[PDB]
Amino acid sequence: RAAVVCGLGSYLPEAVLSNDMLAAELDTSDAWISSRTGVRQRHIAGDLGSGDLALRAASAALASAGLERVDAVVLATSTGDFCCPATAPRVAARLGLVGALAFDLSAAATGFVYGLASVGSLISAGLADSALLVGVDTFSHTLDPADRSTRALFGDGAGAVVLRAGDAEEEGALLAFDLGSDGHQFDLLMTPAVSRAERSSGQASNYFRMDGKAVFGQAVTQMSDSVRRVLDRVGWQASDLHHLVPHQANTRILAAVADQLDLPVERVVSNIAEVGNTVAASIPLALAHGLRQGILRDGGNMVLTGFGAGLTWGSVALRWPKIVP
Amino acid sequence: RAAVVCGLGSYLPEAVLSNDMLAAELDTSDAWISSRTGVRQRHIAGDLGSGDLALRAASAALASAGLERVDAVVLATSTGDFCCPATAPRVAARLGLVGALAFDLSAAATGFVYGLASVGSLISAGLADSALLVGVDTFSHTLDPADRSTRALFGDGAGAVVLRAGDAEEEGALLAFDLGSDGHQFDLLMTPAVSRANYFRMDGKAVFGQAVTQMSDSVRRVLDRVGWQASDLHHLVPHQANTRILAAVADQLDLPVERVVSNIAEVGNTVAASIPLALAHGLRQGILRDGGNMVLTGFGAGLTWGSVALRWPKIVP
């Protein structure tokens, strides 16, 4: 009993932050923003929360799958609408799926990969026959207004897939996983929790921070090595890969991952220039981009891979199924 | 391939807020608190976060299982140490684990039950051979200091089990599940995210009816799935919502309260930690029957609910 991908959907908020806007706001330049990140625009949730974005992505994903019900709704997010409860139950209800198994999973930029492991396993174990997994984050709400580095990189969005029970020989079946963590380096990427004083005031200044230099080099190796492990597990060489869909960490990181694997860079699916780094949403948003562009091959050998806060990392191998755009 | 419970552990913070202390601070009474909630004391985390409590609970559960290591750590919590990342990776690291599969799961007071489903399924599907599940919450950090209802009810703590790969015939095997939600009713139990430009609140009256009805129905559904009647249960171990809710669930299910495991008087309502802390209490008291028919059940914010059936295994304290 396998878990099979059978639907894809996504949603990006309407508002866009350009380099020109960001340069004007923070008294910097267009050059600096592109140079450092290669990101030219990022979508900004504004008054919308992760729940709102997830709802739109999930509805589109259900239409894609040709299904009007699923047994489970899981959100991979670090930017839930509340501290308590999870966002997933509300999203499930707003999809007309009251009664569904629903919860949020926290694994930062590796959330979508961990999400696939969790939902895929629920289906394989017989606790659900179908599921929505939504990778969604609204990191823009959590950025320091004065910080040009993070504001240049991060954007908001949601991407969703539908999984169903199936056979391991079907296109879209999740074939092998690599999953890990290194909590010894937990402090490298962080958005602190609100203090009790901040909760009392009704104002928090708990902003996302990252050690950019320390994150770059490690991110490349972490994802490259994780891909290699899953390639070895499924019996593929790097050359057998048609599609590599990494967490869109930064512009340089994506090509650097290909370099380590001696994989042609053109095989890396990337839209980081148009949407920025959307954390848990990055992989399914990149998938949606590939599908829009007709890049994704029916039955093509594919690996999805992530690395992020925790630290966390992981990869999943599958053959890409026929998905309705 | 089943997931089998093979260890139990817990940790309560040292500090205790007694009814007498709370009565003194908010000008109420032991009588009012005990009548309303059934709570007589509760443990308060203070400077310790959920990560600290989870580490201690986890270490105890490993020792209970006779293991130094497992493949995975999941924390069921709504009060993690950070907004990003999860707390589970740090816990796994400090336990000396090897690149653990690690994340936090959010399902409020149903978190332990959802956790067993997620962790159990990871094991059953072959993604892990062993795992720690920690139900941990420090709700005291999120309560309004002037709110007598929530401060009377909630306490802090962590409880953990070890699960391992095994056979469905083994004692401790997770036998059947029920899991659900109703997000249309999300506003009944809530801790808002704080704006960067908000304490926990509950609608107690509305929550009471839903807690009783959803926990009762969830148990009935899981009983049907495993093939037991309520009268076959040796133990029901519910989320410790409050004493009146547990009594109403027992009556609704035609269960004697004597078979409902509860330590809410001693630890209060600890959200995700409530079920494993109740199990720990039961084992301490010598109440738990070796191989006994057991259902764990939760309901909470989301709204969420769910139940798991298993035969309780021989765990040596």
Method: X-ray
Non-local CB neighbours of A112 within 8 Å, separated by 6+ positions: A76, A133, A135, A159, A247, A280, A281, A282, A283, A284, A304, A306
Q: Locate the chain B residue with the closest alpha carbon to A200.
A: B198
From B261's Cα to the closest Cα of chain A, the distance in A is 25
Parallel/antiparallel/unpaired status of strands A101-106 and A82-84: unpaired
Which of A171, A189, A222 is a domain's end point?
A171
Q: And the tokens for B193?
A: 């995210």
The beta-carbon neighbor of A206 closest among B83, B301, B303 is: B83
Question: Are A195 and A93 part of one and the same domain?
Answer: no
Structure tokens at B183: 């997000």
3-state class (DSSP) for residue B58: helix
Is residue A8 located within the same domain as residue A110?
Answer: yes
On whether both A126 and A260 belong to a single domain, the answer is: no
Structural domain span for residue B263: 172-317
Q: SS3 of A77, please?
A: coil
CATH of the domain at B83: 3.40.47.10
Statement to judge: residues A220 and A105 lie in one domain: no
Residues 6+ apart with CB under 8 A from B240: B246, B262, B263, B264, B267, B268, B269, B270, B274, B275, B277, B278
Number of domains in chain A: 2
Residues A102 and A44 in one domain: yes
Across the beta sheet with A101-106, the strand order is A2-11, A157-166, A130-137, A72-76, A101-106, B101-106, B72-76, B130-137, B157-166, B2-11
CB-based contact, B183 to chain A, within 8 Å? yes
Residues B22 and B57 in one domain: yes
Nearest to B181 among A78, A100, A311 (CB): A100
Query: B108: which chain A residues are within 8 Å (Cβ-Cβ)?
Result: 84-86
Resolution limit, Å: 1.8
* Pair B80, B133 in one domain: yes
Token pair, residue A198, equals: 């901040």
Mutating which of A1, A47, A83 best tests the B interface, going by the most B Cβ atoms within 10 A?
Answer: A83
From residue B37, alpha-carbon distances to A208, B150, B177, B260 in Å are: 39, 10, 28, 16
Four-CA torsion B46, B47, B51, B54, nearest 10 degrees: -50
How many CB atoms are located within 10 Å of the residue A1 CB? 13
Domain end point (choices B153, B171, B189): B171
Nearest-CA neighbor of B126 among B95, B101, B161?
B101
Measure the CA–CA gap between A48 and A155, rounded to whole angstroms: 13
A201 Cβ contact partners less than 8 Å away, ≥ 6 residues apart: none
State the burial class of residue A91 (Cβ atoms within 10 Å of its Cβ: 0-12, 13-18, 19+). Answer: buried
A19 with A161, same domain: the answer is yes
Residue A253's SS3 state is helix
The per-residue DSSP string of A215-228 comes to HHHHHHHHHHHHHH
Question: Do A177 and A69 fall within a single domain?
Answer: no
Residue A59 sits in the same domain as residue A188: no
Domain termination residue (choose one: B146, B171, B196): B171
- Kindly state whether residues A193 and A316 are assigned to the same domain: yes
Residues B88 and B209 in one domain: no
